[PDB]
Short mmCIF file of C-alpha atoms and ligand atoms in Angstrom, two decimals:
data_model
loop_
_atom_site.label_atom_id
_atom_site.label_comp_id
_atom_site.label_asym_id
_atom_site.label_seq_id
_atom_site.Cartn_x
_atom_site.Cartn_y
_atom_site.Cartn_z
CA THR A 1 2.77 -18.54 -51.95
CA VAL A 2 4.26 -16.22 -54.58
CA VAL A 3 5.50 -17.57 -57.90
CA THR A 4 9.14 -16.69 -58.38
CA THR A 5 11.44 -17.21 -61.34
CA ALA A 6 14.20 -18.96 -59.36
CA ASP A 7 13.67 -22.60 -58.33
CA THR A 8 15.03 -22.15 -54.83
CA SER A 9 14.73 -25.81 -53.82
CA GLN A 10 16.67 -27.10 -56.82
CA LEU A 11 19.28 -24.34 -56.49
CA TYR A 12 19.79 -25.12 -52.80
CA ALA A 13 20.23 -28.82 -53.48
CA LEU A 14 22.63 -28.18 -56.36
CA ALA A 15 24.80 -25.82 -54.31
CA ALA A 16 24.74 -28.10 -51.24
CA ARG A 17 26.09 -31.01 -53.31
CA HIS A 18 29.18 -28.87 -53.81
CA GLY A 19 29.67 -27.61 -50.30
CA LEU A 20 27.76 -24.30 -50.52
CA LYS A 21 24.81 -23.55 -48.25
CA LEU A 22 22.48 -21.00 -49.83
CA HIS A 23 20.68 -18.69 -47.46
CA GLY A 24 19.16 -15.33 -48.23
CA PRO A 25 18.53 -13.24 -51.36
CA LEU A 26 19.21 -14.45 -54.84
CA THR A 27 18.85 -13.16 -58.37
CA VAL A 28 18.66 -15.23 -61.58
CA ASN A 29 19.55 -14.56 -65.19
CA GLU A 30 18.18 -17.19 -67.55
CA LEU A 31 18.87 -15.24 -70.73
CA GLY A 32 22.20 -16.89 -71.45
CA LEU A 33 21.93 -19.67 -73.97
CA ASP A 34 24.61 -21.87 -72.42
CA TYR A 35 24.47 -21.07 -68.68
CA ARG A 36 21.98 -20.00 -66.06
CA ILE A 37 23.63 -17.35 -63.85
CA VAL A 38 22.54 -16.88 -60.30
CA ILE A 39 23.90 -14.46 -57.75
CA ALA A 40 23.11 -16.04 -54.40
CA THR A 41 23.78 -15.34 -50.76
CA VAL A 42 25.58 -18.10 -48.88
CA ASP A 43 25.79 -18.84 -45.14
CA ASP A 44 29.23 -17.14 -45.11
CA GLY A 45 27.20 -13.88 -45.46
CA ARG A 46 28.83 -13.45 -48.87
CA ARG A 47 27.34 -13.37 -52.32
CA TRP A 48 28.46 -16.08 -54.73
CA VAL A 49 27.98 -16.43 -58.48
CA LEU A 50 26.55 -19.77 -59.59
CA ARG A 51 27.34 -20.44 -63.21
CA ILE A 52 25.18 -23.42 -64.12
CA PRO A 53 25.97 -25.18 -67.41
CA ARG A 54 22.73 -26.04 -69.25
CA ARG A 55 23.91 -28.99 -71.36
CA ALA A 56 26.63 -31.59 -71.72
CA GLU A 57 28.42 -29.67 -74.47
CA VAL A 58 28.71 -26.62 -72.19
CA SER A 59 29.79 -28.71 -69.17
CA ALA A 60 32.71 -29.96 -71.29
CA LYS A 61 34.23 -26.48 -71.26
CA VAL A 62 34.41 -26.11 -67.47
CA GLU A 63 37.59 -28.08 -66.77
CA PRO A 64 39.76 -26.27 -69.35
CA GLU A 65 38.51 -22.82 -68.25
CA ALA A 66 39.24 -23.74 -64.64
CA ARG A 67 42.88 -24.39 -65.61
CA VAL A 68 43.04 -20.97 -67.32
CA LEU A 69 41.79 -19.13 -64.23
CA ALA A 70 44.05 -21.10 -61.93
CA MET A 71 47.04 -20.02 -63.99
CA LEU A 72 45.98 -16.41 -64.32
CA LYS A 73 45.23 -15.74 -60.62
CA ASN A 74 48.75 -14.80 -59.45
CA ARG A 75 49.79 -13.42 -62.81
CA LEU A 76 47.37 -10.48 -63.06
CA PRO A 77 47.33 -7.25 -60.96
CA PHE A 78 43.54 -7.42 -60.85
CA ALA A 79 40.97 -9.95 -59.75
CA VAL A 80 39.47 -12.85 -61.69
CA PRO A 81 36.79 -15.31 -60.59
CA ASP A 82 38.09 -17.78 -57.99
CA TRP A 83 36.32 -20.96 -59.01
CA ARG A 84 36.18 -22.69 -55.64
CA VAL A 85 33.61 -25.02 -57.21
CA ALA A 86 34.26 -26.19 -60.78
CA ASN A 87 32.54 -29.20 -62.18
CA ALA A 88 30.22 -30.30 -64.94
CA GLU A 89 27.03 -29.40 -63.06
CA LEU A 90 28.16 -26.18 -61.31
CA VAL A 91 30.79 -23.49 -61.33
CA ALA A 92 30.73 -21.21 -58.32
CA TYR A 93 32.90 -18.36 -57.11
CA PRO A 94 32.62 -15.62 -54.52
CA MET A 95 31.16 -12.60 -56.24
CA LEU A 96 33.63 -9.90 -57.13
CA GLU A 97 31.49 -7.14 -55.72
CA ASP A 98 32.94 -4.29 -57.78
CA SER A 99 30.66 -3.06 -60.56
CA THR A 100 31.09 -3.90 -64.20
CA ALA A 101 32.15 -0.87 -66.30
CA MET A 102 28.74 -0.80 -67.62
CA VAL A 103 25.36 -1.50 -66.25
CA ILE A 104 22.46 -3.05 -68.19
CA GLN A 105 19.15 -4.58 -67.18
CA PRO A 106 18.85 -8.20 -68.30
CA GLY A 107 17.00 -8.43 -71.62
CA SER A 108 17.48 -4.77 -72.46
CA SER A 109 19.11 -3.59 -75.65
CA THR A 110 20.36 -0.38 -74.02
CA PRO A 111 22.73 -0.02 -71.05
CA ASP A 112 21.77 2.16 -68.11
CA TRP A 113 25.33 3.41 -67.90
CA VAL A 114 28.81 3.02 -69.36
CA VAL A 115 31.98 4.33 -67.77
CA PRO A 116 32.46 7.78 -69.36
CA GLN A 117 34.65 8.57 -72.33
CA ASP A 118 36.40 11.24 -70.27
CA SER A 119 37.26 8.94 -67.35
CA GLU A 120 41.02 9.13 -67.48
CA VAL A 121 41.34 6.71 -64.56
CA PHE A 122 39.36 4.09 -66.42
CA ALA A 123 41.10 4.62 -69.74
CA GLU A 124 44.56 4.50 -68.21
CA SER A 125 43.99 1.55 -65.92
CA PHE A 126 42.28 -0.46 -68.66
CA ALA A 127 45.34 0.13 -70.87
CA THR A 128 47.77 -1.01 -68.17
CA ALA A 129 45.57 -3.94 -67.17
CA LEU A 130 45.47 -5.07 -70.81
CA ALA A 131 49.25 -4.77 -71.12
CA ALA A 132 49.55 -6.91 -67.99
CA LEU A 133 47.25 -9.61 -69.39
CA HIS A 134 49.11 -9.62 -72.70
CA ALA A 135 52.39 -10.01 -70.80
CA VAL A 136 51.39 -13.38 -69.32
CA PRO A 137 54.05 -15.78 -70.66
CA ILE A 138 52.98 -18.15 -73.41
CA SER A 139 54.83 -20.89 -71.50
CA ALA A 140 52.31 -20.42 -68.67
CA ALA A 141 49.45 -20.72 -71.16
CA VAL A 142 50.94 -23.93 -72.60
CA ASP A 143 51.49 -25.38 -69.11
CA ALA A 144 47.79 -24.64 -68.38
CA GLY A 145 46.62 -26.44 -71.50
CA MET A 146 45.29 -23.34 -73.21
CA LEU A 147 44.26 -23.14 -76.83
CA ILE A 148 47.34 -21.81 -78.62
CA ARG A 149 47.36 -20.06 -81.98
CA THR A 150 50.57 -18.98 -83.65
CA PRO A 151 50.27 -15.91 -85.90
CA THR A 152 49.65 -18.24 -88.87
CA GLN A 153 46.99 -20.22 -86.95
CA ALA A 154 45.38 -16.95 -85.80
CA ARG A 155 45.00 -15.76 -89.38
CA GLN A 156 43.79 -19.21 -90.51
CA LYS A 157 41.06 -19.13 -87.83
CA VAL A 158 39.78 -15.82 -89.17
CA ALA A 159 39.85 -17.25 -92.70
CA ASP A 160 37.95 -20.34 -91.54
CA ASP A 161 35.28 -18.25 -89.77
CA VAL A 162 34.82 -16.05 -92.85
CA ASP A 163 34.53 -19.13 -95.03
CA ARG A 164 31.96 -20.72 -92.72
CA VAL A 165 29.83 -17.56 -92.88
CA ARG A 166 30.18 -17.60 -96.70
CA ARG A 167 28.88 -21.20 -96.79
CA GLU A 168 25.86 -20.64 -94.58
CA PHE A 169 24.76 -17.07 -95.34
CA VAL A 170 24.56 -14.60 -98.23
CA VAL A 171 26.91 -11.70 -97.48
CA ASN A 172 27.08 -8.24 -98.99
CA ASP A 173 29.77 -8.28 -101.69
CA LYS A 174 31.62 -5.28 -100.26
CA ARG A 175 31.81 -6.89 -96.82
CA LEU A 176 33.19 -10.07 -98.31
CA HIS A 177 35.82 -8.13 -100.21
CA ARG A 178 36.75 -6.17 -97.10
CA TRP A 179 37.39 -9.36 -95.15
CA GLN A 180 39.31 -10.94 -98.02
CA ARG A 181 41.46 -7.84 -98.53
CA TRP A 182 42.20 -7.84 -94.79
CA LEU A 183 43.16 -11.50 -94.81
CA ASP A 184 45.53 -10.78 -97.72
CA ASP A 185 47.03 -7.61 -96.20
CA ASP A 186 50.26 -8.95 -94.70
CA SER A 187 51.19 -5.65 -93.00
CA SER A 188 48.00 -5.63 -90.91
CA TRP A 189 48.72 -8.92 -89.10
CA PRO A 190 50.89 -9.32 -86.04
CA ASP A 191 54.05 -11.40 -86.02
CA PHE A 192 53.30 -12.74 -82.53
CA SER A 193 50.40 -13.93 -80.35
CA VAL A 194 49.57 -13.24 -76.69
CA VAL A 195 47.27 -14.45 -73.96
CA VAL A 196 43.94 -12.82 -74.76
CA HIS A 197 40.72 -12.61 -72.80
CA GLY A 198 38.81 -13.22 -76.06
CA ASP A 199 35.48 -11.58 -75.15
CA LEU A 200 36.69 -8.31 -73.65
CA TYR A 201 34.52 -5.18 -73.40
CA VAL A 202 33.25 -2.87 -70.68
CA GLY A 203 30.64 -5.44 -69.54
CA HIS A 204 33.37 -7.92 -68.58
CA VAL A 205 35.64 -5.41 -66.85
CA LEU A 206 35.19 -4.63 -63.14
CA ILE A 207 36.00 -1.22 -61.68
CA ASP A 208 36.30 0.18 -58.18
CA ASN A 209 34.41 3.30 -57.01
CA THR A 210 37.03 5.56 -58.62
CA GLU A 211 36.56 3.79 -61.98
CA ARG A 212 39.94 2.07 -61.76
CA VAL A 213 40.01 -1.39 -63.34
CA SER A 214 39.97 -3.93 -60.54
CA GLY A 215 38.99 -7.20 -62.23
CA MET A 216 37.84 -9.02 -65.36
CA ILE A 217 35.20 -11.72 -65.69
CA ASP A 218 33.75 -14.18 -68.24
CA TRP A 219 36.98 -15.84 -69.47
CA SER A 220 35.43 -18.61 -71.60
CA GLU A 221 37.01 -17.34 -74.83
CA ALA A 222 40.54 -16.99 -73.42
CA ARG A 223 43.37 -18.38 -75.56
CA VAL A 224 46.71 -17.41 -77.07
CA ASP A 225 45.91 -15.46 -80.23
CA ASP A 226 45.97 -12.04 -81.95
CA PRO A 227 46.26 -9.22 -79.38
CA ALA A 228 43.88 -7.01 -81.34
CA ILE A 229 41.04 -9.35 -80.38
CA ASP A 230 41.00 -7.60 -76.98
CA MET A 231 41.02 -4.06 -78.43
CA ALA A 232 38.10 -4.16 -80.92
CA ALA A 233 35.43 -3.45 -78.33
CA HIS A 234 37.39 -0.51 -76.97
CA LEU A 235 37.29 1.07 -80.42
CA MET A 236 33.60 0.23 -80.65
CA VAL A 237 32.71 1.90 -77.34
CA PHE A 238 35.25 4.75 -77.08
CA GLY A 239 35.92 5.54 -80.75
CA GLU A 240 39.16 6.34 -82.53
CA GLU A 241 40.14 8.91 -79.91
CA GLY A 242 39.72 6.29 -77.19
CA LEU A 243 41.72 3.78 -79.20
CA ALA A 244 44.55 6.25 -79.76
CA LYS A 245 44.84 6.88 -76.03
CA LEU A 246 44.71 3.14 -75.31
CA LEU A 247 47.53 2.36 -77.74
CA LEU A 248 49.82 5.07 -76.37
CA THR A 249 49.44 3.93 -72.76
CA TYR A 250 49.44 0.21 -73.62
CA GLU A 251 52.78 0.62 -75.38
CA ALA A 252 54.19 2.74 -72.54
CA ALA A 253 53.18 0.00 -70.08
CA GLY A 254 55.19 -2.56 -72.04
CA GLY A 255 52.56 -3.76 -74.46
CA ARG A 256 53.96 -4.92 -77.76
CA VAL A 257 52.65 -3.02 -80.74
CA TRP A 258 53.21 -2.99 -84.50
CA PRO A 259 52.86 -0.15 -86.94
CA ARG A 260 49.43 -1.03 -88.39
CA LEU A 261 47.89 -2.13 -85.09
CA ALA A 262 45.20 0.57 -85.10
CA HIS A 263 44.17 -0.38 -88.63
CA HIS A 264 44.14 -4.06 -87.70
CA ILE A 265 41.90 -3.36 -84.70
CA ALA A 266 39.34 -1.67 -86.94
CA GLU A 267 39.40 -4.68 -89.27
CA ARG A 268 38.94 -6.98 -86.26
CA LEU A 269 35.96 -4.90 -85.20
CA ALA A 270 34.40 -5.30 -88.69
CA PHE A 271 35.04 -9.04 -88.29
CA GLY A 272 32.67 -8.90 -85.32
CA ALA A 273 29.86 -9.40 -87.84
CA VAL A 274 31.35 -12.82 -88.58
CA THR A 275 31.60 -13.67 -84.90
CA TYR A 276 28.01 -12.63 -84.35
CA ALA A 277 26.71 -14.59 -87.35
CA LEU A 278 28.44 -17.79 -86.23
CA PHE A 279 27.14 -17.34 -82.70
CA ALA A 280 23.66 -16.91 -84.18
CA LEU A 281 24.05 -19.98 -86.40
CA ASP A 282 25.37 -22.17 -83.58
CA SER A 283 22.65 -20.90 -81.22
CA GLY A 284 19.77 -21.88 -83.49
CA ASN A 285 17.95 -18.82 -82.16
CA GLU A 286 15.74 -17.36 -84.86
CA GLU A 287 15.93 -13.80 -83.48
CA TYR A 288 19.74 -13.80 -83.42
CA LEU A 289 19.74 -15.42 -86.88
CA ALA A 290 17.40 -12.73 -88.18
CA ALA A 291 19.72 -10.02 -86.87
CA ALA A 292 22.84 -11.72 -88.26
CA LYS A 293 21.39 -12.19 -91.74
CA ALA A 294 20.25 -8.60 -91.83
CA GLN A 295 23.66 -7.33 -90.80
CA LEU A 296 25.55 -9.57 -93.22
CA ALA A 297 23.44 -8.58 -96.23
CA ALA A 298 23.65 -4.89 -95.38
CA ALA A 299 26.36 -2.70 -96.75
CA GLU A 300 28.69 -1.63 -93.95
C1 LIG B 401 28.56 -1.22 -75.23
C2 LIG B 401 27.42 -2.02 -74.64
C3 LIG B 401 26.89 -3.05 -75.66
O1 LIG B 401 27.97 -3.95 -75.87
C4 LIG B 401 28.49 -4.23 -77.12
O2 LIG B 401 28.05 -3.79 -78.16
C5 LIG B 401 29.78 -5.05 -77.10
C6 LIG B 401 30.93 -4.22 -77.61
C7 LIG B 401 29.55 -6.38 -77.86
O3 LIG B 401 30.77 -6.94 -78.31
C8 LIG B 401 31.13 -6.65 -79.65
C9 LIG B 401 32.66 -6.67 -79.78
C10 LIG B 401 33.26 -8.09 -79.74
C11 LIG B 401 34.74 -7.92 -80.02
O4 LIG B 401 33.05 -8.73 -78.53
C12 LIG B 401 33.53 -8.25 -77.27
C13 LIG B 401 32.58 -8.87 -80.81
O5 LIG B 401 33.00 -10.20 -80.75
C14 LIG B 401 31.09 -8.78 -80.72
C15 LIG B 401 30.29 -9.81 -81.48
O6 LIG B 401 30.48 -7.53 -80.52
C16 LIG B 401 28.81 -7.44 -77.03
C17 LIG B 401 29.76 -8.02 -76.00
C18 LIG B 401 28.12 -8.58 -77.84
O7 LIG B 401 28.23 -9.84 -77.20
C19 LIG B 401 29.12 -10.84 -77.65
O8 LIG B 401 28.54 -11.38 -78.81
C20 LIG B 401 29.30 -12.47 -79.27
C21 LIG B 401 28.64 -12.93 -80.55
C22 LIG B 401 29.36 -13.60 -78.28
C23 LIG B 401 30.05 -13.05 -77.03
N1 LIG B 401 30.31 -14.01 -75.93
C24 LIG B 401 31.13 -15.12 -76.43
C25 LIG B 401 29.10 -14.53 -75.32
C26 LIG B 401 29.28 -11.83 -76.54
O9 LIG B 401 29.94 -11.25 -75.42
C27 LIG B 401 26.63 -8.27 -78.24
C28 LIG B 401 26.23 -9.18 -79.37
O10 LIG B 401 26.53 -6.94 -78.59
C29 LIG B 401 26.74 -6.41 -79.87
C30 LIG B 401 25.76 -8.55 -77.00
C31 LIG B 401 24.25 -8.27 -77.23
C32 LIG B 401 23.49 -8.81 -76.05
C33 LIG B 401 23.89 -6.80 -77.44
O11 LIG B 401 23.49 -6.35 -78.51
C34 LIG B 401 24.04 -5.76 -76.35
C35 LIG B 401 22.75 -5.34 -75.67
C36 LIG B 401 25.02 -4.62 -76.45
O12 LIG B 401 24.82 -3.86 -77.61
C37 LIG B 401 25.66 -3.84 -75.27
C38 LIG B 401 25.81 -4.76 -74.07
O13 LIG B 401 24.62 -2.92 -75.05
N1 LIG B 402 30.13 -7.34 -60.63
C1 LIG B 402 30.17 -8.69 -61.01
N2 LIG B 402 29.35 -9.17 -61.98
C2 LIG B 402 29.42 -10.49 -62.30
C3 LIG B 402 30.32 -11.36 -61.69
N3 LIG B 402 30.17 -12.61 -62.24
C4 LIG B 402 29.20 -12.53 -63.16
N4 LIG B 402 28.76 -11.28 -63.20
C5 LIG B 402 27.72 -10.89 -64.17
O1 LIG B 402 27.02 -11.99 -64.69
C6 LIG B 402 27.36 -12.12 -66.11
C7 LIG B 402 27.61 -13.58 -66.46
O2 LIG B 402 28.79 -14.12 -65.86
C8 LIG B 402 28.53 -11.15 -66.31
O3 LIG B 402 28.72 -10.72 -67.65
C9 LIG B 402 28.21 -10.03 -65.31
O4 LIG B 402 27.15 -9.20 -65.74
C10 LIG B 402 31.14 -10.79 -60.67
O5 LIG B 402 32.01 -11.55 -59.97
N5 LIG B 402 31.05 -9.50 -60.36
#
């Protein structure tokens, strides 16, 4: 035989327990710390994504995320995963075959490709898609049992994350003062919350052949919270010029803005160091921890 990374017999049995008959090519990504991700061919001739929780604490998150996606399906003008299997041992959905807005080889630190800066179709359709997401009524989020943060709770969560990093790591003094100044800067913070994706960047956005946004994936961080959460990565990837274009079109599409939104988004992006450090800490992974500590101690 030939040794292969995927355990085809175990994967077949797992899928079959949930009404899916695997047959044909599959691909496996075991780099995720919480899930194994397999793209598999099923006897319907279609590819399906198998999202396999690794541990009980991850399995616990399946049921609430399933309620989120069930609520979002009809309320977004783009596709989201259709979790036709959702249980503690397996999530599975038909693959949304459109490409992500970037392409990267598993394990690599460098993408092969990112949708270009000058793609007006991408920029525009991402802005309108984001306005549509942020227009989902909070009532619908409450009815779906989502995590809800008022503006005060949103700001408290950021404070709590900063304080946890301060307890566990040694942070550059200027970084600490930046975060504290932000937390104390009333004019930066929004006076409302919206449904956010929570982990939104080009790698979780799907596009058609023309580069028009057609879907979003990986909704595990979705909640009602600060809208700027979903704009930080756009600034990170497309710069201030990209952000300026996003905010103009987002507002024109009905997105609610506030005067210091662009500033707030930059502060949220800086806060990404906190998010990364807590991910590292909770992961127990020494390589991620090494990177986090180095970033935190470094002057920005
Ligand atoms: C351009 C392409 C590059 O993407 C980015 O830089 C995004 C803008 C990031 O989001 C930025 C912006 C941000 C707002 O997230 C969208 C912010 O939270 C974050 C930490 O970094 C990522 C997505 C981060 O992931 C996020 O890291 C979190 C700690 C946990 C998140 N999730 C729950 C599993 C996860 O998706 C990550 C750390 O990159 C550096 C992923 C890590 C594997 C890499 O270094 C990558 C190879 C990348 O540099 C990239 C793919 O080449
Ligand atoms: N194009 C596409 N990629 C997916 C889909 N589901 C998962 N992926 C990929 O697998 C990762 C983990 O879910 C994502 O970040 C994507 O890289 C999908 O339906 N379509």
